Amino acid sequence: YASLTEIEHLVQSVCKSYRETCQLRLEDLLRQRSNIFSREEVTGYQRKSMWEMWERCAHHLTEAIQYVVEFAKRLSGFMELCQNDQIVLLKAGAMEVVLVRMCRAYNADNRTVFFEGKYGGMELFRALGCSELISSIFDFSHSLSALHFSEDEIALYTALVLINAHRPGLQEKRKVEQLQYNLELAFHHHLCKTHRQSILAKLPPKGKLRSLCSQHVERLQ
Amino acid sequence: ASLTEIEHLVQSVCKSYRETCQLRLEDLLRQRSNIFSREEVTGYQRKSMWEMWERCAHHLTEAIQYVVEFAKRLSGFMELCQNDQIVLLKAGAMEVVLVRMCRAYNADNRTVFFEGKYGGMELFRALGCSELISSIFDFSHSLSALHFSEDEIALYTALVLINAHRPGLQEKRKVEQLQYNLELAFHHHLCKTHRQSILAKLPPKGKLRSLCSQHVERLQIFQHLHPIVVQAA
Amino acid sequence: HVERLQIFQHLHPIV
Ligand SMILES: CC(C)CCC[C@H](CCCC(C)(C)O)[C@H]1CC[C@H]2[C@@H]3CC=C4C[C@@H](O)CC[C@]4(C)[C@H]3CC[C@]12C
Ligand SMILES: CC(C)CCC[C@H](CCCC(C)(C)O)[C@H]1CC[C@H]2[C@@H]3CC=C4C[C@@H](O)CC[C@]4(C)[C@H]3CC[C@]12C
């Protein structure tokens, strides 16, 4: 890139890409916070078979991954990567991006997540028999809520979750590095322009995204 | 090698198609009297090319999903490496959609089941490519002449997919082994049902390819001027 | 990791 104005064009493009593919608009998530499942509705979910709850969740997770893939395709140089690397980057990082995106759907005031039109807590998922997995991701969402992530910060952050030249299997590792280094500078530049460089120490640590998703990537479908 | 294993392969490939045929033959036939009226056809023709492309791209994308699902259930396909699976499906998935189309094509009145009703090719006027549309309507018409059974479609589209000559395969021997066993299943099942007469009436491998090559050029310029995102199953 | 295929199907839904 070799200039600071091109980096700003990157920042704006990454943020426009995320605005177009964020799936659930933030302002709509916020107004919906007062819309919460009743005890009867929660009980209806808990009586469902694990198989029905898994089919619902697999559906919502597939749709979520689709929006992430669309986000990556719009990242400035992602489509210039060979097809192998685009697949490697997405299969390694799309779950993690989905987990980062979940903090927008998460209400820390009552520890509920937007699920199928309303907010509910983790007891909504009891039939899955996955208390610790579900509990791990509400807690992680709870941590990220404290950062009060803006939309552009999430955009820039999830771009770096995907464009990670450390993913094993990459055929053109150098190309991804140039993409990664420029996105990193964009992230740091943008944080200084908004006086938000304090988040850089508060982000989730190395491999905490990987470890949380690697605990979930084990399921029979 | 035994005929017991070939017959089991037949039964399995047929079961896979039944579960991924997307539209039940019974429903397509029962819906034949449900035709778009002149005004509804006018409504389709008044649409912009972009609105027609978005709808068509949506229904085609859904069609591909069912074809991918059918592939995954073919005995031995998921034992191929990830690269060869991708190679086979991208060379073949559209060819399979073109074959599957003849189930939704009524030869009596030259209509296709599209979005709930039957209509002719005039439905797609807004797209501005009546030559490409005529080609696939005529190809469907020819396949309809054959009265493909559901199991003939299943076994024939399996071999459209499982083609060891696709460029870029890494384990061509493993695909060769799959293609041969499917050829045995297809040829045996034609004898069991006394349908060996369709082998010579099928379109040669080049006609599906040439017909789909004619459309993929218009589909990629249309997809990159504005794309589409569709829910899965 | 998502399987390579599903990830391909998200990348190119029409190919
Ligand atoms: C690493 C995680 C991301 C894994 C998904 C967790 C959870 C269910 C897990 C079931 C299992 C059997 C695997 O244990 C899924 C189910 C539905 C998902 C939500 C669907 C839609 C959205 C909208 C999107 O804008 C942000 C993310 C969010 C809220 C998903 C979060 C993850 C959920 C709850
Ligand atoms: C098979 C392809 C080689 C040809 C696609 C033709 C057409 C769109 C053409 C627009 C273009 C700009 C490319 O000229 C598509 C659009 C909608 C498609 C149908 C949707 C669903 C089904 C059900 C499935 O069970 C069998 C096939 C069928 C009928 C599709 C046929 C092809 C259609 C009409």
Curated annotation (Swiss-Prot), chain A:
It is found in: Nucleus. The AF-2 (activation function-2) motif is required for recruiting coregulators containing LXXLL motifs such as NCOA1 and NCOA2. Belongs to the nuclear hormone receptor family. NR1 subfamily. Nuclear receptor that binds DNA as a monomer to ROR response elements (RORE) containing a single core motif half-site 5'-AGGTCA-3' preceded by a short A-T-rich sequence. Key regulator of cellular differentiation, immunity, peripheral circadian rhythm as well as lipid, steroid, xenobiotics and glucose metabolism. Considered to have intrinsic transcriptional activity, have some natural ligands like oxysterols that act as agonists (25-hydroxycholesterol) or inverse agonists (7-oxygenated sterols), enhancing or repressing the transcriptional activity, respectively. Induction: Up-regulated in the state of obesity. It comes from Homo sapiens (Human). It is linked to Immunodeficiency 42: An autosomal recessive primary immunodeficiency characterized by increased susceptibility to concomitant candidiasis and mycobacteriosis. Candidiasis is characterized by persistent and/or recurrent infections of the skin, nails and mucous membranes caused by organisms of the genus Candida. Mycobacteriosis is characterized by infections caused by moderately virulent mycobacterial species, such as Bacillus Calmette-Guerin (BCG) vaccine, environmental non-tuberculous mycobacteria, and by the more virulent Mycobacterium tuberculosis. Interacts (via AF-2 motif) with the coactivator NCOA2 (via LXXLL motif). Interacts with the corepressor NCOR1. Interacts with CRY1. Interacts (via AF-2 motif) with the coactivators NCOA1 and PPARGC1A (via LXXLL motif). Interacts (via AF-2 motif) with PROX1. Interacts with FOXP3. Interacts with NR0B2. This is Nuclear receptor ROR-gamma. It comes from the Eukaryota.
